[PDB]
Design a protein around this ligand. Structure first.
Ligand SMILES: CCCN(CCC)S(=O)(=O)c1ccc(C(=O)O)cc1
Ligand SMILES: [Cl-]
Length: 474
């Protein structure tokens, strides 16, 4: 069928190398946006601005947001004095998100993930109607414009609104980056394309660490990260629309003109000449010839409820650990580098294990170790720095490996008639976990160590539900 035409037109040739590289390139800045709150919203040490004046906690530091009424307690009313030695200006220092507004920092991150969740749902449907190239162009422009306006937001509600729209646009690019590349690649390569995207996203953690080290101002950093998406919109007009979508849309005239252009780039002009309407109609016989069944059929229910738990738990604990970089005693400019560095060997071990033993034993190992490492982190006293840092790095490594393991597992358990819906609805649960993770982080005011326990007790429970899945090997 269609797979033969791509092989006939040149397979993986010059066009595929140019297009896939250009489409996947913006994924470097994807990790620089989700994690950006660690650098544009860091909390420097703040002691209350005097009108001797500042009571001290039993540790010894000046108490946060309590000052003596008369010189040697009353809450701050003249503002705060921040530490300008390592963080010049973050959104916490710009709008006093310190004591009565601790949750306002986490709420802004939660509102961003609502954009990511809403972006995939809306722009996923919009892609199937206006194409994959047109939606990608509109997402490149929206990400650049909405990201830029956040760097100039005069009010906190304006900052949240212009970051929610950035999250809405940044889900469309990630979703369409996979679709526009997979559809132009042969079927047997589809497994490799998903791996490349994850590794490309992995290198994005390094880029954020490098940029945030040289441009610490939050207004400059937010603008600088969203600046390149203007250049990703200028060259987005030269993409070649996915020919598979054109054939499915019923416009077989377009899919002949799309394939011939690929033949010219790939150099197989003569084989491109043989293409015509009549051969296209005959070859594309099975191409032109629903989530409701995912909740109705009994045998498919057991997969959806189970698989939604692994997707949710893996992402819920991933963003409950990535966003905590300041409680380790090491500079965040180094922990972020280490966090992205452990991503690669952990994924390689994950790929090595599944091919060696299976998928179910790999899934239990990936999550339970992450749940144990996170849980042990909370009990271990903060005095230990190397011990606590090692556990968190090891925990984030497993959760990175769990993402690859659960992505391949979803693509092999769901039947081919449902996979597109099952994978699409599977990743939606992942974005739901990213929303709830900051909200769970907001309860640290009720109990200092509660968020770590919830971030650890969830993957442990998920490791106790992955035993209800048929392993796929051979
Ligand atoms: C199903 C999407 C998962 N995501 C969460 C969306 C809010 S993601 O941010 O795009 C991501 C994170 C990490 C890795 C990895 O390292 O394996 C891959 C993808
Ligand atoms: Cl996503």
């Amino acid at each position: 069928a269609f797979n033969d035409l791509l092989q006939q037109v040149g397979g993986v040739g010059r066009f595929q190398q140019i297009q896939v590289t250009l489409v996947v390139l913006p994924l470097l800045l994807m990790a620089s946006h989700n994690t950006l709150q660690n650098f544009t919203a860091a909390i420097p040490t703040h002691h209350c601005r005097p009108p001797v004046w500042l009571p001290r906690d039993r540790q010894g530091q000046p108490e946060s947001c309590l000052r003596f009424t008369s010189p040697q307690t009353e809450p701050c009313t003249d503002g705060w004095i921040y530490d300008n030695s390592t963080f010049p200006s973050t959104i916490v220092t710009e709008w006093d998100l310190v004591c009565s507004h601790r949750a306002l920092r986490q709420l802004a991150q939660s509102l961003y993930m609502v954009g990511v969740l809403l972006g995939a749902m809306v722009f996923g449907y919009l892609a199937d109607r206006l194409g994959r190239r047109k939606v990608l162009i509109l997402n490149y422009l929206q990400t650049a414009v909405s990201g830029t306006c956040a760097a100039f937001a005069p009010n906190f509600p304006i900052y949240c609104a212009f970051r929610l729209l950035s999250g809405m646009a940044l889900a469309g690019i990630s979703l369409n980056c996979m679709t526009l590349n997979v559809e132009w690649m042969p079927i047997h390569t589809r497994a490799c394309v998903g791996t490349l995207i994850g590794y490309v996203y992995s290198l994005g953690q390094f880029l954020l660490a490098g940029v945030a080290y040289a441009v610490p101002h939050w207004r400059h950093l937010q603008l600088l990260v969203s600046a390149p998406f203007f250049a990703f919109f200028i060259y987005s007009w030269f993409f070649i629309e996915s020919a598979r979508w054109h054939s499915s849309s019923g416009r077989l005239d377009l899919t002949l003109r799309a394939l011939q252009r690929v033949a010219r780039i790939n150099g197989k002009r003569e084989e491109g000449a043989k293409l015509s309407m009549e051969v296209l109609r005959a070859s594309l016989q099975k191409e032109l010839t629903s989530a409701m069944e995912l909740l109705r059929c009994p045998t498919l229910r057991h997969l959806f409820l189970c698989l939604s738990m692994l997707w949710f738990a893996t992402s819920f604990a991933y963003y409950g650990l990535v966003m905590d970089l300041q409680g380790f005693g090491v500079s965040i400019y180094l922990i972020q580098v280490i966090f992205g560095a452990v991503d690669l060997p952990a994924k390689l071990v994950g790929f090595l294990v599944i091919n060696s033993l299976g998928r179910r034993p790999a899934q239990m190992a990936a999550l339970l170790l992450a749940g144990i490492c996170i849980l042990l982190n909370g009990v271990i006293p903060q005095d230990q720095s190397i011990v606590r840092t090692s556990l968190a790095v090891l925990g984030k490594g497993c959760l990175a490996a769990s993402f690859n393991c659960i992505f391949l597992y979803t693509g092999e358990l769901y039947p081919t008639m449902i996979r597109q819906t099952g994978m699409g609805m599977g990743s939606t649960m992942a974005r739901v976990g990213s929303i709830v993770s900051p909200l769970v982080s907001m309860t640290a005011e009720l109990y200092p160590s509660m968020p770590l326990f919830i971030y650890g007790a969830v993957p442990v429970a998920a490791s106790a539900v992955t035993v209800l899945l048929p392993e796929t090997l051979g």
